[PDB]
RNA sequence: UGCUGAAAGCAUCUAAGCACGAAACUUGCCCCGAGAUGAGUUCUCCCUGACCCUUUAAGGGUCCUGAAGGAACGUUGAAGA
RNA sequence: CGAUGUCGGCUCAUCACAUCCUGGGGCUGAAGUAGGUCCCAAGGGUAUGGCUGUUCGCCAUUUAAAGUGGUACGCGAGCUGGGUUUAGAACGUCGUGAGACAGUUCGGUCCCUAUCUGCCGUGGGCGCUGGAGAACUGAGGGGGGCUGCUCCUAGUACGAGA
RNA sequence: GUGAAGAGGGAAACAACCCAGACCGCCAGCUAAGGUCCCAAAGUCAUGGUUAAGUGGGAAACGAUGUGGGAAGGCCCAGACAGCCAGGAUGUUGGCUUAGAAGCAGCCAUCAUUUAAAGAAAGCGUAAUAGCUCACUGGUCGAGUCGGCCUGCGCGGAAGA
């Protein structure tokens, strides 16, 4: 089934009547407007493309402005589309609310993780550091050996080395949905989700049922 | 070869149709359709069935021999059918049946359900004996084998599911 | 957070006063023991008249930790020292007759009934 | 099941069979005479 | 491990045919991915004025127009050498 | 021999299967739990300490297991320098002696700013053909794949009992 | 003999293996070893056989109703081989080493009746017994069947970074 696009809004905890406190991530899921519906006849697959939020009138380009005007949908920030499960249908211009998550229990949240920049092997791949004393010289956090000898004669592809860490989309799956608030457009999910505050997130029902 | 050179008499009230190499036989139980090997030719041979190996196949005689056995099996099945008897040995063993599904409890923590295929009927005259009937011998043998595989007989008490007409070897602990 | 080579006090009156943890049980490559995990210890100094002598290896259960324990609502319990209770290596069975100091309720595993009963508090 | 390289008719009730290019010995009296590689 | 089954009247898991059968294999889960030069698909937006020249060609030169959009610059960022 | 640094340790690994564990099976002198042996299986996993420079090994306590090998007995332009293997000194022994001893002790400089291949990241150029802004399909590639204990079934099947 | 001190063609690459000894030029022809489906020049050429294994295109002792051919031999419509309802008994619980070996541990003969037909004993199984089979013998269908030798080509044996 289709997901929804929301914005991460900090974190909080919910106190239950029995005493236990549930850490919850707050996701602001306002109305999602369908801008385009894809069908097997034309696109070879069925999907719905949705938009959310708002954009400055002078900031949206003409190609994007015409695309929204065709669907009669107010311009929003970015576009995302979700594949259909063959059991439901949608129409252009339809608005989708967070209420569809009322009957679900597990969700999958996808977002861009925080960017750590160029990271070393110790931080990136949990490499073990070498001794800080006992004669060690300029080799306290160095990766160490990266190959065997002449017989391979090369470093194998996929070697773990320092490089860019974070700033890629990652998915946290099977997260418990704690509360849904349609009128206030909130979705409380137990746990933590990728990305920093204000980052766009995609929420869909858990697939590992 | 030798078996192939032995036509089988078709009893009255049985319809045989030869569509190319496909054979359809209708008796009193149902229509049985079987595709035959390309290396064997069959003619109506009114009142009988005959099989001949076409030239150009080294194993032509063998394919004829197995073909004749298959045709006889279907002829017997449609005329009368095939029945197999299975026995359940062991305290607390039930073999209740209802509709098209067999329920068994072979000492497992959960019930065992078996979905019989089309054209197979199961009856339970007694709580431990189950009898299966059908129009062809291959399917009944397969179904009975599937039923037996659930709890193979073991050679200390002869428990589990066994065929009505088989002998199960038994052995005893020598010292301990 | 009890790991190998850690000093522990003895809550019971078995005669031991200080023990060394030499192994954390319950898993391969386990790092440190929690609130109520079984550990293997060696006695470093005990009462001469006690039933347990120095330099003997026997199991033990942690009852108090300096690091503390976390409650489901976010609360924590912390102590000024680490304490344990002695065992029998075949059946858990704390050999002590009385245990001093508070004991947390995390040990209620349908089994440590003897420990909790002897506990002056909780 | 013996996986020896040499197969023989250990008893009278032993039959030589070929299955999937593998020569097997099947006995209907005692399982101890069943052997695979031939 | 089998069902049926001849060669070999029997038997036989196999030769024809039909069943099951493992953390292995393919998929299912997550991520990258059309430089996939085999460079894909869909949606939307913008440009529809004149002169001449020759070895008259998917040719060259001049005037007027240069849109969508992009870049640059600035303020910057939970993005970043 | 106009120079290929040769034992251990650390970091980082990768492959084979003659499999240590987990998975699927045959036989058993397999009652059950637990075993013995053989076949299929390399997806993942596959200890911490004391003594010694040690690999190994003995010992202590864990785990489902603490697998066997290849890779310059993997890896010093990645680290250490304990052993061995310069110059000092001493002991035992051999020699008249200088000295010698896979005999033993004390002490004893480990250089390199990366051109190319490779690998981990991240950009520019052009192409994909009128140009431009977006959203995708997905060929193909990679990551992940471990498992203990307790309870129910049941104290059931099995067993004279345990 | 070749290389060293010899190029050229062939064996994928490969001084020393096979063919063959380069005076120079030619967009001429015929051959050697080796080859002729495509990479890649030339037979998807002709005739008669073999192989089912990717054998060909690594490897042995040894194992096996794989398959082709040859020379024979025993039994066979006074009817064979495999199947099918049948029979397989009486002392020989033996004297013998009497502990029980009684056919199924051996000293031992290896007798004898009913007989269409049976042995003082071949297998499994009992402390020995018992018991179940096969040797052998009747009846139906009924035609070939059985065990060795010579070998052609194949299969297993056959696991490494």
UniProtKB/Swiss-Prot annotation, chain A:
GO annotations of cellular component type: cytoplasm; cytosol; cytosolic large ribosomal subunit
Modified residues (N6-succinyllysine): 38
Stretch forming the signal peptide: none
Pfam families: Ribosomal_L3
Record InterPro entries: Ribosomal_uL3 (IPR000597), Ribosomal_uL3_bac/org-type (IPR019927), Ribosomal_uL3_CS (IPR019926), Transl_B-barrel_sf (IPR009000)
Xref: SUPFAM superfamilies: Translation proteins (SSF50447)
Description of post-translational modifications: Methylated by PrmB.
Top-level lineage group: Bacteria
HAMAP family, alphabetized: Ribosomal_uL3_B
Stated role: One of two assembly initiator proteins, it binds directly near the 3'-end of the 23S rRNA, where it nucleates assembly of the 50S subunit.
Family note: Belongs to the universal ribosomal protein uL3 family.
Subunit organization: Part of the 50S ribosomal subunit. Forms a cluster with proteins L14 and L19. In pull-down experiments interacts with CedA.
Name the record gives this protein: Large ribosomal subunit protein uL3
Organism: Escherichia coli (strain K12)
Higher taxonomy: Bacteria, Pseudomonadati, Pseudomonadota, Gammaproteobacteria, Enterobacterales
Swiss-Prot record, chain B:
UniProt GO cellular component terms: cytoplasm; cytosol; cytosolic large ribosomal subunit
InterPro entries: Ribosomal_uL6-like (IPR000702), Ribosomal_uL6-like_a/b-dom_sf (IPR036789), Ribosomal_uL6_a/b-dom (IPR020040), Ribosomal_uL6_bac-type (IPR019906), Ribosomal_uL6_CS (IPR002358)
Keywords: Acetylation, Antibiotic resistance, Ribonucleoprotein, Ribosomal protein, RNA-binding, rRNA-binding
GO BP terms in the entry: cytoplasmic translation; response to antibiotic; ribosomal large subunit assembly
Intrachain disulfide bonds: none
GO MF terms, alphabetically ordered: large ribosomal subunit rRNA binding; structural constituent of ribosome
Modified residues (N6-acetyllysine): 43
General function of this protein: This protein binds directly to at least 2 domains of the 23S ribosomal RNA, thus is important in its secondary structure. It is located near the subunit interface in the base of the L7/L12 stalk, and near the tRNA binding site of the peptidyltransferase center. Gentamicin-resistant mutations in this protein affect translation fidelity.
Family to which the UniProt record says this protein belongs: Belongs to the universal ribosomal protein uL6 family.
Complex formation: Part of the 50S ribosomal subunit.
Entry protein name: Large ribosomal subunit protein uL6
Protein source organism: Escherichia coli (strain K12)
Classification lineage: Bacteria, Pseudomonadati, Pseudomonadota, Gammaproteobacteria, Enterobacterales
UniProtKB/Swiss-Prot annotation, chain C:
Keyword Transcription: no
An annotated GO cellular component: cytoplasm
InterPro entries tied to this protein: Ribosomal_uL14, Ribosomal_uL14_bac-type, Ribosomal_uL14_CS, Ribosomal_uL14_sf
Effect upon mutating residue 117 to A: No change in RsfS binding
GO terms of biological process kind: cytoplasmic translation
Top-level division of the source organism's lineage: Bacteria
GO molecular function: large ribosomal subunit rRNA binding; structural constituent of ribosome
SUPFAM superfamilies for this protein: Ribosomal protein L14 (SSF50193)
Keyword terms: Ribonucleoprotein, Ribosomal protein, RNA-binding, rRNA-binding
Variant or mutagenesis effect after changing residue 114 to A: Reduced RsfS binding
PROSITE patterns from the UniProt entry: RIBOSOMAL_L14
Signal peptide segment: none
SMART domains (UniProt xref): Ribosomal_L14
Pfam family, one: Ribosomal_L14
UniProt entry tagged with the keyword Ribosomal protein: yes
HAMAP family: Ribosomal_uL14
Cited function: Binds to 23S rRNA. Forms part of two intersubunit bridges in the 70S ribosome. In the 3.5 A resolved structures L14 and L19 interact and together make contact with the 16S rRNA in bridges B5 and B8.
PANTHER family referenced in this protein's UniProt entry, alphabetically: 50S/60S RIBOSOMAL PROTEIN L14/L23, LARGE RIBOSOMAL SUBUNIT PROTEIN UL14M
Subunit structure: Part of the 50S ribosomal subunit. Forms a cluster with proteins L3 and L19. Forms two bridges to the 30S subunit in the 70S ribosome, contacting the 16S rRNA. In pre-50S ribosomal subunits interacts with RsfS, which may inhibit association with the 30S subunit.
UniProt record similarity statement: Belongs to the universal ribosomal protein uL14 family.
Name of protein: Large ribosomal subunit protein uL14
Organism: Escherichia coli (strain K12)
Record lineage: Bacteria, Pseudomonadati, Pseudomonadota, Gammaproteobacteria, Enterobacterales
Gene name in the database record: rplN
Curated annotation (Swiss-Prot), chain D:
Domain of life: Bacteria
Coiled coil: none
InterPro entries linked: Ribosomal_bL36, Ribosomal_bL36_sp
GO BP annotations, alphabetical order: cytoplasmic translation; translation
A single Gene Ontology CC term: cytoplasm
Entry annotated with the keyword Phosphoprotein: no
Keyword rRNA-binding in annotation: yes
Pfam families: Ribosomal_L36 (PF00444)
Keywords tagged on the record: Ribonucleoprotein, Ribosomal protein, RNA-binding, rRNA-binding
Gene Ontology molecular functions: rRNA binding; structural constituent of ribosome
HAMAP family registered for this protein in UniProt: Ribosomal_bL36 (MF_00251)
Annotated NCBIfam families: rpmJ_bact
Similarity remark: Belongs to the bacterial ribosomal protein bL36 family.
Quaternary structure and interacting proteins, as annotated: Part of the 50S ribosomal subunit.
Role played: One of the last ribosomal proteins to be assembled in the 50S subunit, it contacts a number of helices in the 23S rRNA, acting as molecular glue. The simultaneous presence of uL16 and bL36 probably triggers ObgE's GTPase activity and eventual dissociation from the mature 50S ribosomal subunit.
Record's protein name: Large ribosomal subunit protein bL36A
Source organism phylogeny: Bacteria, Pseudomonadati, Pseudomonadota, Gammaproteobacteria, Enterobacterales
């Amino acid at each position: 089934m289709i997901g929804l696009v929301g914005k991460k809004v900090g974190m909080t905890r919910i106190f239950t009547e029995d005493g236990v406190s549930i850490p919850v991530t707050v996701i602001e899921v306002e109305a999602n407007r369908v801008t385009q519906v894809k069908d097997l006849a034309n696109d070879g697959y069925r999907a719905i493309q949705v938009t959310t939020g708002a954009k400055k009138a002078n900031r949206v380009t003409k190609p994007e402005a015409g695309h929204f005007a065709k669907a009669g949908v107010e311009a929003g920030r970015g576009l995302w589309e979700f594949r259909l499960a063959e059991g439901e249908e949608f129409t252009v211009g339809q608005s989708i609310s967070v209420e569809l998550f009322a009957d679900v229990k597990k969700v999958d949240v996808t977002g861009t993780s925080k960017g750590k920049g160029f990271a070393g092997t110790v931080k990136r791949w949990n490499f073990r550091t070498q001794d800080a004393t006992h004669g060690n010289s300029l080799s306290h956090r160095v990766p160490g050996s990266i190959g065997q000898n002449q017989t391979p004669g090369k470093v194998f592809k996929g070697k773990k080395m320092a490089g860019q860490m974070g700033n890629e989309r990652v998915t946290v799956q099977s997260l418990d949905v704690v509360r849904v608030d349609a009128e206030r457009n909130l979705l409380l999910v137990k746990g933590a989700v990728p990305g920093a505050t204000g980052s766009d997130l995609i929420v869909k029902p858990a697939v590992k049922a | 070869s030798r078996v192939a050179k032995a036509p089988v008499v078709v009893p009255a009230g049985v319809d045989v149709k030869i569509n190319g190499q496909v054979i359809t036989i209708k008796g009193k139980n149902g229509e049985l359709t079987r595709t035959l090997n390309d290396a064997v030719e069959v003619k109506h041979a009114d009142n009988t069935l005959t099989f001949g190996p076409r030239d150009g196949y080294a194993d032509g005689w063998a394919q004829a021999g197995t073909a004749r056995a298959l045709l006889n099996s279907m002829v017997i099945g449609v005329t009368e059918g095939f029945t197999k008897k299975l026995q359940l040995v062991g305290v607390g063993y039930r073999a209740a049946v209802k509709g098209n599904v067999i329920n068994l409890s072979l000492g497992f923590s959960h019930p065992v359900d078996h979905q019989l295929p089309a054209g197979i009927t199961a009856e339970c005259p007694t709580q431990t004996e189950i009898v299966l009937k059908g129009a062809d011998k291959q399917v009944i043998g397969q179904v009975a084998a599937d039923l037996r595989a659930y709890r193979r007989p073991e050679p200390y008490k002869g428990k589990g599911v066994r065929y009505a007409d088989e002998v199960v070897r038994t052995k005893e602990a020598k010292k301990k | 957070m009890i790991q190998e080579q850690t000093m522990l006090n003895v809550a019971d009156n078995s005669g031991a006063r200080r023990v060394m943890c030499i192994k954390v049980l319950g898993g391969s490559h386990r790092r440190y023991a929690g609130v109520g995990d079984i550990i293997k210890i060696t006695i470093k100094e005990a009462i001469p008249r006690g039933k347990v002598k120095k330099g003997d290896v026997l199991k033990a259960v942690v009852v108090r930790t300096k690091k503390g324990v976390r409650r489901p609502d976010g609360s924590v319990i912390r102590f000024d020292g680490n304490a344990c209770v002695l065992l029998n290596n075949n059946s858990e069975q704390p050999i002590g007759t009385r245990i001093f100091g508070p004991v947390t309720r995390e040990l209620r595993s349908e089994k440590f009934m003897k420990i909790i009963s002897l506990a002056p508090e909780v | 099941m013996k996986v020896r390289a040499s197969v023989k008719k250990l008893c009278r009730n032993c039959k030589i069979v070929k299955r999937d290019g593998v020569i097997r010995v099947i006995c209907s009296a005692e399982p101890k005479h069943k052997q695979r590689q031939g």
